Amino acid sequence: MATVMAATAAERAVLEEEFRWLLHDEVHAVLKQLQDILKEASLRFTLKQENFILDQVKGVLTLQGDALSQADVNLKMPRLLHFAFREDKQWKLQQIQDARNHVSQAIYLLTSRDQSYQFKTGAEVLKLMDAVMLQLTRARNRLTTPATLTLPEIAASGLTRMFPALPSDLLVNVYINLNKLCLTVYQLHALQPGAVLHSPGAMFEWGSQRLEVSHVHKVECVIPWLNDALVYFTVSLQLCQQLKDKISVFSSYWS
Amino acid sequence: MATVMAATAAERAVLEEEFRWLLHDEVHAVLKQLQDILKEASLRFTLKQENFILDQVKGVLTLQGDALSQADVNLKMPRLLHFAFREDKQWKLQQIQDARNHVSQAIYLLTSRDQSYQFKTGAEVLKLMDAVMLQLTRARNRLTTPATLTLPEIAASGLTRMFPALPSDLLVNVYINLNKLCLTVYQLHALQPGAVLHSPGAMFEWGSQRLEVSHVHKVECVIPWLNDALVYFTVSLQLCQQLKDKISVFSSYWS
Amino acid sequence: EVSHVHKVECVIPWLNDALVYFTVSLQLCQQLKDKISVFSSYWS
Amino acid sequence: EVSHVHKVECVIPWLNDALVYFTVSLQLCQQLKDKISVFSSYWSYR
């Protein structure tokens, strides 16, 4: 009988539609929450603590946003030496700038969409989620220790120029590792008549001379607002994943 | 006007071409660097330290390349027993052999290509990168503790045969865990009238008898050249990923 | 506003056993997938 | 100046055989390479 089948088909069509509205509201709820969390994460990168104390080598670094405004270092040798920047100079930590960029892009992805359209399949939501998650994971990854930084790249870095001015038996590197501001001093040794190891006994060329890393000193300190930011990234990623999974369940449920 | 459009189109075509050459040089630079790093990683697996001292159970193991040439073990019981190999015998650690194979394959992938061809889309570079990265990640994974090794497989291993010759209340396993040579002694207990747990209170059958693990003793020691190799793997993976990402950015930029 | 946070924890043995089981099962699955791929690429 | 061009040709059976042998050999080599790569990507050759 055709009347049965038609009224009936109307009943399933009604249920599916109502569920589509439920999923619509869920999607926009999660999106709004993402904008809130991510804007707070953004606010963490611009101005909260600025002075940090970092074993057997010690340091007091003043870090304002992405700019290492000052770096005062004491190295205890077999003998102590003391170093500082040009007083006037600032060294920018590229990791923070990069991360802040990814955050900015994610937030743009969330705020540049009309929060007023009727619900669809979800593949579009899925693409939005993928984009945002890519930005977050990239931010986090950049915050992490870059492995591909060579000793000659460290030497060619402006940071070496930034200090009283110091010899070529010492290299200084300052970077970020997830939730920790990191200061590393490489003690070198010219060799008698690659570069990736970063461990004692690593060899590389610099200038026109051949050098070997003799010792490595590593100190670090937690940066509270970086930690907050990372926590935000993790939470946002999970929110995105949950939305993706629910959308998949829905779409497979009614197909 | 058609003259405008043609000269113009020539201008964009010129810019895109020049950028294609930039990307060409970048690709080959990164590839060369990969061969250097990976060949050093390769050199680490063949001959550097050979004798290693490994809690409440102690061991002196002589490891040459992939071959555990000797293993001298002291076990302190409630009472001490002392064990060694047949003096003449060597136990090979399969993880190192496997890892070395993956490294060999990666290096082949890099050296068996003409470093002189004109630049293309990149999908081919992308496939090369995927292949290499798969080999690296597999090497690293193999170096890691294999979870799927059962106690009966440990018993059926030649290592048990390799020791003075010892009872069936003791099983000895030597394996690699990332950057650590590992020695584990399983103290057993025949049961009165699966096998995966590796924890105290795990049960399994061996020979024609049913046995239970009574206690587990685990000691380990860092292998410096393994650590160097792993560091190399990580750095290479990141270099590959960076190249993939840049190629994607380029390809999406001009499409 | 949260003023202080106190966190304590304790290992649950059977949860640990379960997790170990999950890891081992995942590896078994992965190994089977990889072998199947090797086979299929080998004869194609 | 070239006024006209005349081109005649003939199949050389043994040359043809040679080309066939080259191609077939190339194919054998690639198949072996593929098997070796497939196996070696997961297991050790020895």
Cα separation, D16 vs B226, whole angstroms: 55
With a CB cutoff of 8 Å and minimum separation 6, the contacts of B68 are B61, B62, B90, B91, B92, B93, B174
> Are the beta carbons of D35 and C42 separated by less than 8 Å?
yes
Cα separation, D20 vs D9, whole angstroms: 19
Strand B170-176: give its sheet, edge to edge.
Answer: B170-176, B180-190, B209-222, B203-206
> Are the beta carbons of D42 and C41 separated by less than 8 Å?
no
| Angle, vertex CA B82, rays to CA B80 and CA B84, nearest 5 | 165
Per-residue tokens: B208 = 């024609």
Cα separation, A198 vs A209, whole angstroms: 18
Cα separation, B94 vs B78, whole angstroms: 34
* D26 close contact with C: CB closer than 8 A: no
Phi, psi (deg, nearest 5) at residue B190 = -60, 140
- E strand segments, A124-253: 170-176, 180-190, 203-206, 209-222
A7 burial level (CB within 10 Å; 0-12, 13-18, 19+) = exposed
Rounded to a whole number of angstroms, the distance from the CA of C31 to the nearest CA of chain D is 10
Contact between B205 and B211 under an 8 Å Cβ cutoff? The reply is: yes
Residue B183, strand partner residues: B174, B219
- Run of H or E residues at A250: helix A224-254
Given the structure tokens 């009988």, which residue do they identify?
A1
B to A contact (≥3 Cβ pairs closer than 8 Å): yes
Per-residue tokens: B231 = 């560091």
B201: left (phi over 0), alpha (psi -120 to 50) or beta: left
Task: For residue A107, give the nearest of A42, A172, A166 by alpha carbon.
Answer: A42
DSSP state of A204: E
Give the residue from A196, A197, A213 with the most B CB atoms within 10 Å of its CB, the best one to mutate. Answer: A196
> Are the beta carbons of B147 and C31 separated by less than 8 Å?
no
Alpha helices for chain B (secondary structure H): 2-43, 94-111, 123-143, 151-155, 158-161, 224-254
Long-range Cβ pairs for the range A21-26 (8 Å, 24+): A21/A119, A23/A119, A23/A122, A23/A246, A23/A247, A23/A250, A24/A118, A24/A119, A26/A243, A26/A246
> Are the beta carbons of B197 and C20 separated by less than 8 Å?
yes
Q: How many helices (H) and strands (E) does chain A have?
A: 6, 9
Which residues in B lie closer than 8 A to residue C17 (C-beta atoms)? 197, 199
B to C contact (≥3 Cβ pairs closer than 8 Å): yes
The distance of Cα B255 from the centroid of its chain, to the nearest Å, equals 39
Per-residue tokens: B203 = 């049960």
Instruction: Count contacts between A and B (CB, < 8 Å).
Output: 22
* D33 close contact with C: CB closer than 8 A: no
Rounded to a whole number of angstroms, the distance from the CA of D19 to the nearest CA of chain B is 25
Phi, psi (deg, nearest 5) at residue B177 = -125, 75
Which residues in B lie closer than 8 A to residue A148 (C-beta atoms)? 235, 238-239, 242
In one-letter notation, the amino acid at residue A92 is K
Long-range Cβ pairs for the range B191-195 (8 Å, 24+): B195/B150, B195/B151, B195/B152
A212-231 burial: b if 16+ Cβ within 10 Å, else e: ebeeeeebbbebebbebbbe
Cα separation, B100 vs B176, whole angstroms: 14
In one-letter notation, the amino acid at residue B94 is Q
Contact between A125 and A49 under an 8 Å Cβ cutoff? The reply is: no
B230 burial level (CB within 10 Å; 0-12, 13-18, 19+) = buried
- Pick the residue from chain A with its C-alpha nearest to B41: A194
DSSP state of A113: S
Contact between B126 and B244 under an 8 Å Cβ cutoff? The reply is: yes
First to last CA, chain C: 64
Alpha helices for C1-44 (secondary structure H): 13-43
Contact between A202 and A151 under an 8 Å Cβ cutoff? The reply is: yes
Contact between A178 and A230 under an 8 Å Cβ cutoff? The reply is: yes
Give the residue from B26, B34, B49, B228 with the most A CB atoms within 10 Å of its CB, the best one to mutate. Answer: B228
Cα separation, B24 vs B116, whole angstroms: 10
| Angle, vertex CA B208, rays to CA B206 and CA B210, nearest 5 | 60
Give the residue from D36, D41, D46 with the most B CB atoms within 10 Å of its CB, the best one to mutate. Answer: D41
> Are the beta carbons of C24 and B148 separated by less than 8 Å?
yes
Q: Calculate the alpha carbon distances from B1 to A180, B5, B6, B57 in Å.
A: 60, 7, 9, 87
- Resolution limit in angstroms? 2.8
B226 burial level (CB within 10 Å; 0-12, 13-18, 19+) = buried
Return the SS3 of A105.
Answer: helix
> Are the beta carbons of C38 and D35 separated by less than 8 Å?
no
DSSP state of B221: E
Which residues in C lie closer than 8 A to residue B196 (C-beta atoms)? 20-21, 24
Contact between B211 and B188 under an 8 Å Cβ cutoff? The reply is: yes
Contact between B237 and B137 under an 8 Å Cβ cutoff? The reply is: yes
Alpha helices for A62-112 (secondary structure H): 94-111
Residue A103, strand partner residues: none
Task: Kindly state the greatest CA–CA separation across chain A.
Answer: 100
Cα separation, A62 vs A47, whole angstroms: 14
Rounded to a whole number of angstroms, the distance from the CA of D45 to the nearest CA of chain B is 8
Per-residue tokens: A76 = 């205890």
Give the residue from C19, C20, C22 with the most B CB atoms within 10 Å of its CB, the best one to mutate. Answer: C20
> Are the beta carbons of B196 and C27 separated by less than 8 Å?
no
> Are the beta carbons of C17 and B198 separated by less than 8 Å?
no
DSSP state of A119: P
* D40 close contact with B: CB closer than 8 A: yes
Long-range Cβ pairs for the range B52-56 (8 Å, 24+): B52/B181, B52/B221, B52/B223, B53/B221, B54/B181, B54/B182, B54/B183, B54/B219, B54/B220, B54/B221, B55/B217, B55/B218, B55/B219, B56/B217
Cα separation, A177 vs B21, whole angstroms: 34
Per-residue tokens: B24 = 């060409």
From the list B40, B234, B238, the residue facing A194 with the nearest CB is B40
Phi, psi (deg, nearest 5) at residue A129 = -60, -45
Contact between B225 and B181 under an 8 Å Cβ cutoff? The reply is: no
Cα separation, A22 vs A16, whole angstroms: 10
Per-residue tokens: B158 = 């030649």
